[PDB]
Design a binder for this molecule. Sequence first.
Ligand SMILES: [Cl-]
Ligand SMILES: [Cl-]
Ligand code: NA
Ligand code: NA
Lengths: 369, 369, 77
Amino acid sequence: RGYDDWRLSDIPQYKDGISTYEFVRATHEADYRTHQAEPVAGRTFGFNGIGRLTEVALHMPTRYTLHDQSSQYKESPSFFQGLMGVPDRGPVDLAAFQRETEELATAFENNGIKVHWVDYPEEPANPYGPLMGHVFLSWGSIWRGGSVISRFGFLPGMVGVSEYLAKWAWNTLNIPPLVAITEGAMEPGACNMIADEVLVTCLSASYDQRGTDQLVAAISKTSGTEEFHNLQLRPAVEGFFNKATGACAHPDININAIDVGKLVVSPAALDWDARTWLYDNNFELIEADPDEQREFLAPCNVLLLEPGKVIAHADCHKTNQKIRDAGVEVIEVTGTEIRKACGGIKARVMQINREPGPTLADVRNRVWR
Amino acid sequence: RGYDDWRLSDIPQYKDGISTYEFVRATHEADYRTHQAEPVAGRTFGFNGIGRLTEVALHMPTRYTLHDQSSQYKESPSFFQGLMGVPDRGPVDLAAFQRETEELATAFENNGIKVHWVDYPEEPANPYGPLMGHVFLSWGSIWRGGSVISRFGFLPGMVGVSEYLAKWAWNTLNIPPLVAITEGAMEPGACNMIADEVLVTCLSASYDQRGTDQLVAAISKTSGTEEFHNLQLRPAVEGFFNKATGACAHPDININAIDVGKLVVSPAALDWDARTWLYDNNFELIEADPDEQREFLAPCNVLLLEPGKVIAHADCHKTNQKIRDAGVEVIEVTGTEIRKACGGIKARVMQINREPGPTLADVRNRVWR
Amino acid sequence: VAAISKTSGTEEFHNLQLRPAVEGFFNKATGACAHPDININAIDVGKLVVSPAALDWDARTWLYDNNFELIEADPDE
Ligand SMILES: [Cl-]
Ligand SMILES: [Cl-]
Ligand code: NA
Ligand code: NA
């Protein structure tokens, strides 16, 4: 479009004979996401919901990606094993880590999903030390309306990182920031949604109420839905993971949607109120295998590609058969080196774009019980 | 600092023998601005308050900066004269516009203030037409805690622009985004503060309550002050400016601080509640000349360099003498071409960094009445 | 308003409250006035004559929503 070819008809609020007041009022009334955020960006974006995922980012690990190679970890492995609480499966193997990363990328390419690659500087550090956990790009997943700077609850190695990923998203994809979390703790990228307007959070080391309130208020205004629901789990865990029980600070280790009104769910996830809400709203529950969960094989850390199809850890054999039994296709992918820190496959994927998908009304209307 | 020289003592929440819970809790309790925003940026920033201004940005105009040269303006001058409502002083003169821009930059250099320069692309456009009003970089002023994407109430030519300036601030100064305004209208950069924790807004074409609530909640959490006050003027004006009265949609045309508890104020600004609040809180009022105000010479659009010293339009002779009479130094600067659109000198300056300055308690404690 | 609403002979009673910028009775710089009857008045059913210095944004919004047509007084008058 030529610079001198623009006319007033190109302004959507403009009408011939409109008064100043009416034009201004029409402007005040416009939807941010569809009038400002997306047109300025020149594209749609956001991972909200359980519709068809189209675009992600991965990080190919280098030696600097390995948490056990930070000088602060070397100084006290037990401090970080306290924070993270995951079972010790030995040192991370760089080459095997790189191979399961390739395998995941191939799974995406084979399912028609665009993969961007995010790199970090050599010797990457923040004001408090080497970066740590920066392979877990879900922490930079993009919401309807824009990107989010997180407040990390337990991992100081992630200070600076949600900034880095959001800056990357702006510079590379033209995706704007929506909000910075500035109180308490809130790690929205580790949350999952179980319908178009239903978010799952936890109260945990990774989320307090103030942080949660701040996030939910921002994303609800750009969600593109009339309602917005937050289901808040209350896991019993001190740091990230409770190796006695399988309980986890992060929703995406606790629960995820596998189809319309079908969820895979940890046995350590659901307090009575959460169970009640899920029952009342007509969600069918597939229970993850208890040993897979407790041993931190991340059987709930599956990635929904679209209703009825997920990527899962290839060695979560029992949970995956239950998922297939519920009529869902499982794409098995190796994810073993990734689990030596605080996440699995879904945790390491930055979700950039997911198409609008089934709603809470759709869940409620499904006849199955 | 070497990558392998980092230790746990470099994490401010870390203490020898700290439990996981206690470390996490300490992390939740940290101040965002001072633990995360500023260290990651590698600097302090924000224009809040009435202390000493140190750093700004200007735009040197090109032909594309001139509002009267947009094809949409050519199509209907009267549509845009409706929105803006400023007196018609003839076509903008590019060369004279460039000269008063140089003069302002020299005033900054002579007063020890760093000036960054912001450029826009050739034929700059947003989804709705040529950019318009993009010389007014105050609209991209930086708050304590970060940058803000605005919701413009009356000028569609500024869609995309607060994004551009915030992106520029991130890429060039490493200053992060704080929040995007996503409802109603809110043009925070056109607001002024009259103490360290006292903001002035309007309800007008440029601000509704929802937009205002969203902004104030975000900036109050990073303000670095125990309290935060919003004085909200209620000007009688349909678009930006009311040429019958001198009333304006923007606070920075209505009022500004010239010293500790001394304000220059338009006669068309103060409703009874605003007047009462200012009286109760011990603010001394210097009234702008009524003709300077009504004719849109922008006598209130002065820029506070520090308490007791302002930059003002050189032809606001009557207001400026009243400011000197109140014991304030006036640095007179030509600002005539700038006033052919919706602002004057303070409006065109992006404020990046102002040092903490006097507080509302300081205002209240000054003995003068 | 509480007293007159009880005897108004109407089911509802509405108060539109203008917020003029004026220190005493009249602001000779602007035309703003402490008194509604210098600011605005009805001239017909849903037609008002209105000062340019009268209407803050909320007042303007209310009048718009309630379908009042506005005739603007001459600014110099
Ligand atoms: Cl109207
Ligand atoms: Cl404890
Ligand atoms: Na917010
Ligand atoms: Na009475």
